């Protein structure tokens, strides 16, 4: 039960992604309209060429209201795909919020 529901580009695709860059985050898991696609409110990280440095996107996205943010931790299949999507194996993911802290660990299986 909600009284207001807005949608704004928290992390715009056209900007704010200079280092990993790229937009080819499509997959066959969600192939609507006969084409590889992905979640609209989510972005699959793909390296630009063979570079994938650390990411820091500390944002406020604060409009005087509670803002719901969603994200996924991609666990790959083979180590070849890990270096074909991220160029490094031993990574870590951390979402730093005043109410939520988590040090993620990727898994290859």
- In terms of C-beta density within 10 A (0-12 exposed, 13-18 middle, 19 or more buried), how is residue 99 classed? exposed
CA distance 72 to 42: 8
Structure token digits, residue 32: 């609507």
**Distance in angstroms (rounded) separating the CA atoms of residues 47 and 99:** 30
Name which of 74, 71, 64, 75 is nearest 108 in CA terms. Answer: 75
Stated resolution in angstroms: 3.2
Q: What is the biggest distance separating any 2 CA atoms in the chain, rounded to whole angstroms? A: 47
Taking each continuous run of H as one helix and of E as one strand, the counts in the chain are 1, 2
Experimental method: X-ray
Q: Give the integer Cα–Cα distance in Å for 44 and 6.
A: 23
């Amino acid at each position: 039960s909600v009284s207001s529901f807005e949608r704004f580009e928290i992390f715009p695709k056209t900007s704010s992604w200079p280092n990993h860059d790229s937009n080819k985050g499509v997959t066959a898991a969600c192939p609507h309209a006969g084409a590889k696609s992905f979640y609209k409110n989510l972005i699959w990280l793909v390296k630009k060429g063979n570079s994938y440095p650390k990411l820091s996107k500390s944002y406020i996205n604060d409009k005087g209201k509670e803002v719901l943010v969603l994200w996924g931790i991609h666990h790959p299949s083979t180590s070849a795909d890990q270096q074909s999507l991220y160029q490094n194996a031993d990574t870590y993911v951390f979402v730093g919020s005043s109410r939520y802290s988590k040090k993620f660990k990727p898994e290859i299986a």
